[PDB]
Design a protein around this ligand. Structure first.
Ligand SMILES: Cc1cc2nc3c(=O)[nH]c(=O)nc-3n(C[C@H](O)[C@H](O)[C@H](O)COP(=O)(O)OP(=O)(O)OC[C@H]3O[C@@H](n4cnc5c(N)ncnc54)[C@H](O)[C@@H]3O)c2cc1C
Ligand SMILES: *[C@@H]1O[C@H](CO)[C@@H](O)[C@H](O)[C@H]1NC(C)=O
Length: 467
């Protein structure tokens, strides 16, 4: 409250996580400017039907492994948020033919096993690659290498399996994704292979609220944060930085002065025009910004008069093996999570997301009915009473859902993304050293970025040397 002053742009998970570590170090003169009317960012729940569902992150990915994922204790022990281990063991039983009903289990299981071992091969190769990524490649090239082919999985089952294995995780096709940096994934190698599905009407966002309440003044009766240092509905539009200090202009024309600015807005937002930098950021930094990927991952939710889809063991995850790659193939049913709610989840990513976001909710529900009517020619399938189409790409405060490591981005130029310019510091999942794309990554980037700065402010070490 006296000493250097840091303005933190954004009250998402990395924004909150940074400001906490800052407060703890003694840097308590904090101003958090949050663009929307709530903290938590891409951890955001919403009312669908009569339930609360997640628009953003829904999983704690990487549990049960060699090292404790820091998100996990908070979820499972502290807040005891309702959640379920995901079981993908049965997918072979649950892949639907484009016209009429399920494939032969034994058949699918083979293609699965075959996919798995190509990826096991690519794991081995990845570990041999030079650390400069002089000799990195796309996941797809590794697939071609192994499958001895001009192309990757190119037939309806093979693709939806490919999609499940990759797109469903990184929101972009294997052919744009760097092998060296996704195969294998530090989230899973480090924290475990398991993923847990948070279904707790408090919201996964509860994790961020909780960390916020560690250091921000909250009302004793109500619980709401009331700390003057948190400023909602504050859209940062300009950042002026000289060696003297920094100016932050918001959209209602407020100008704040600080010693240092911590910027936690998504790589998507950074890629847009929303925040103008004066001076323009160095060419190196701009190049790093535009070369990395901000993927879109859309969780279409559906309400039904009755159920028509199998429930029971292995019935949560099913795929639709469309002849058109990435066309309503990934489906989730919620017998455990919201029983008996009668809702389905289809996921889409990337090119389909951008199409679907731009098109009428109506039109979309059309396309989905058609697919569902194809998948269960047997049953008598009612129209969905309600659809939900999260439009994160469209939203100017997000412009996507999480980062993806593309081919051609190496370790050096990844680091340039996170490297500070002057008194301008960056945090956010996209700056995470080993966990870009993830809640825990965003959380841990909070701490790291905070520490880079604490080192400058207190210990007077301010030249950050990129590697
Ligand atoms: C659809 C979806 C699916 C996902 N699934 C998973 C999952 O299951 N598990 C997992 O771990 N990860 C998943 N994630 C990724 C994970 O949610 C993110 O890595 C993390 O939550 C992002 O936090 P952040 O602090 O890096 O960024 P953000 O949460 O985006 O924080 C930035 C904040 O700044 C605000 N803002 C932006 N611009 C400005 C401005 N100009 N002025 C002031 N404030 C600004 C934003 O509103 C936002 O609150 C998912 C995310 C999405 C959206
Ligand atoms: C989480 O909590 C449950 C019930 O509270 C406990 O029994 C279990 O050990 C925990 N699960 C994991 C994966 O750690």
């Amino acid at each position: 409250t006296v000493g250097p002053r840091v303005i933190v742009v954004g009250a998402g998970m990395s924004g909150i996580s940074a400001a906490k570590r800052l407060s703890e170090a003694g840097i308590t003169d904090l101003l958090i400017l949050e663009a929307t009317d709530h903290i938590g960012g891409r951890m955001h729940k919403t009312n669908f039907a009569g339930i609360n569902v997640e628009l953003g992150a829904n999983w704690v990915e990487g549990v049960n492994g060699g090292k404790m994922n820091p998100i996990w204790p908070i979820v499972n022990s502290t807040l005891k948020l309702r959640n379920f281990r995901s079981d993908f063991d049965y997918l072979a039983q649950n892949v639907y033919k484009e016209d009429g009903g399920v494939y032969d289990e034994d058949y699918v299981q083979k293609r699965i096993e075959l996919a798995d071992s190509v990826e096991e091969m690519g794991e081995k190769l990845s570990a041999t690659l030079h650390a400069s990524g002089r000799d990195d490649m796309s996941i797809l090239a590794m697939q071609r290498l192994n499958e001895h082919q001009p192309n990757g999985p190119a037939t309806p089952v093979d693709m939806v399996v490919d999609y499940y294995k990759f797109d469903y995780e990184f929101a972009e096709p294997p052919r744009v994704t760097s092998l060296q940096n996704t195969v294998p994934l530090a989230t899973f190698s480090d924290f475990g292979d398991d993923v847990y599905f948070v279904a707790d009407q408090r919201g996964y966002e509860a994790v961020v609220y909780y960390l916020a309440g560690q250091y921000l003044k909250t009302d004793d009766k109500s619980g709401k944060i009331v700390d003057p240092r948190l400023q909602l509905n504050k859209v940062v539009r300009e950042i002026k930085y000289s060696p003297g200090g920094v100016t932050v202009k918001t959209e209602d024309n407020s100008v704040y002065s600080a010693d240092y600015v911590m910027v936690s807005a998504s790589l998507g937002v950074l890629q847009s025009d929303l925040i103008q930098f004066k001076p323009k950021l160095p060419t190196w930094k701009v190049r790093a910004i535009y070369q990395f990927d901000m993927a879109v991952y859309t969780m279409i939710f559906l309400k039904f008069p009755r159920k028509f889809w199998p429930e029971g063991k292995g019935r949560e995850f099913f795929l639709y093996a469309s002849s058109r790659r990435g066309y309503y193939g990934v489906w989730q049913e919620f017998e455990k999570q919201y029983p008996d709610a009668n809702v389905l989840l289809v996921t889409v990513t990337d090119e389909e997301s951008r199409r679907i976001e731009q098109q009428s909710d109506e039109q979309t529900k059309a396309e989905i009915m058609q697919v569902l009517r194809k998948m269960f020619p047997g049953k008598d399938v009612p129209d969905a009473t309600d659809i939900l189409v999260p439009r994160w790409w469209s939203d100017r405060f997000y412009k996507g859902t999480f980062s993806n490591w593309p081919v051609g981005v190496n370790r050096y130029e990844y680091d340039q993304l996170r490297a500070p310019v002057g008194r301008v510091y960056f945090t956010g999942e996209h700056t995470s050293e080993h966990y870009n794309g993830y809640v825990h990554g965003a959380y841990l980037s909070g701490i790291d970025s905070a520490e880079i700065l604490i080192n400058c402010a207190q210990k007077k070490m301010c030249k950050y040397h990129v590697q």
